[PDB]
Symmetry: C3
Subunit: 113 residues, 3 copies
């Protein structure tokens, strides 16, 4: 049950959020080896941000997965998510961060896994 | 000094935020064994989200506590928070995540604990 | 490549966000010993919050740094960030939290570090 929070400084519309959600569903299944229905995704658009001396279009994506990551998984996720944010949002790769964490515990449907 | 961030895809009004804050104050004291005045709670309503193939009402609650959790605490917290979000927001349990982390350090009142 | 997310319950304007960004750039370089251009900062103002029995002006700052922190760094960061939030926002020190985490992995410019 991974969580992916997407912060961007630009506006997101239906089209971009759907396209990103489908990207994240694909990487959850294909790279993370997990069911795509179980990735919970939040979108935080028009976030005031500052990076490398400016407020120009920038993104920070956070990935949370219980049990951490396989050895080649984060590099793949970073590659795919970056290109997708550049595609959909027009944000340049050198203004995109992707951070990886793993929680200690995760509850879903009232119970912990 | 725990932190609880509540993201929901639905609107929260005064009534729901107060009711949730009182739920979180109670679980901090009764389950976490900590002073209820020291839980900091943030509310992020009307968050665009995607989960299990849809944007239907969904919640993600994050819990951060320095020093981690007792062996039965996360299951209790998850049970209480889930029911409370279902009660106040009408969000179904199988569309509610609760993630648990613990920071390395925490500052309050200008000093670290 | 640290990340600093600033949540406050009060409104932030251009002036406050610029002033805080410059504070965070300075502490990244001077305390964290890292390039100030590489701190990514997000600002989340007018966040509905609850703490110590009220919704009065309150702040939660999250700091994420790959590889963790030197022994005296978090205390310094907490001291500087707290005073700066009190200065710019008028939020009292005993209503300011600063949490420190470190991600497992970080991507920037399509690649992981």
């Amino acid at each position: 049950m991974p969580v992916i929070q997407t912060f961007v400084s630009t506006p997101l519309d239906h089209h971009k959020r759907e396209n990103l959600a489908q990207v994240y569903r694909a990487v959850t299944r294909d790279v993370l080896g997990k069911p795509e229905d179980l990735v919970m995704m939040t979108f935080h658009d028009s976030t005031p941000m500052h990076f490398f001396g400016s407020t120009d279009p920038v993104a920070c994506v956070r990935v949370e997965a219980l049990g951490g990551y396989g050895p080649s998984e984060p590099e793949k996720v970073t590659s795919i998510v970056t290109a997708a944010i550049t595609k959909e949002c027009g944000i340049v790769a050198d203004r995109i961060f992707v951070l990886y964490f793993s929680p200690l515990h995760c509850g879903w449907n009232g119970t912990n896994f």
